Amino acid sequence: IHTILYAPNGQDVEIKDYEDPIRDITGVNGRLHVDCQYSQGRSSATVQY
Amino acid sequence: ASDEEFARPTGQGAEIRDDGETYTTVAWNATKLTEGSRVTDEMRDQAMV
Ligand SMILES: [Mg+2]
Numbered sequence: 727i728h729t730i731l732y733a734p735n736g737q738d739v740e741i742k743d744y745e746d747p748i749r750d751i752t753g754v755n756g757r758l759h760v761d762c763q764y765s766q767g768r769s770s771a772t773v774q775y
Numbered sequence: 776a777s778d779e780e781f782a783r784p785t786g787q788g789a790e791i792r793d794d795g796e797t798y799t800t801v802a803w804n805a806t807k808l809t810e811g812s813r814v815t816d817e818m819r820d821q822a823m824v
Pocket residue numbers: 780781782783794
């Protein structure tokens with residue numbers, strides 16, 4: 727089971743603070759591109775009630 | 776340059792408004808002032824001054 731992470735810059739989560747000097751605000755923004763996929767779904771069993 | 780003005784009271788996180796320096800000019804001309812005189816070579820010699 728693969729967690730595929732993508733970033734145009736670097737590899738991990740991209741979290742940045744920035745300042746708006748027109749409004750006197752710090753923004754903190756986070757982004758990430760993610761998907762999750764089995765290579766072999768047969769390799770997992772769910773337990774059901 | 777334009778005269779000194781005053782800042783304005785502003786809400787927190789609100790856009791700071793533009794009131795930049797504005798300019799004008801004073802034109803100069805420059806008029807030619809002239810003055811002249813002539814002295815005869817005979818009197819350039821003869822005068823006591
Ligand atoms: Mg003002």
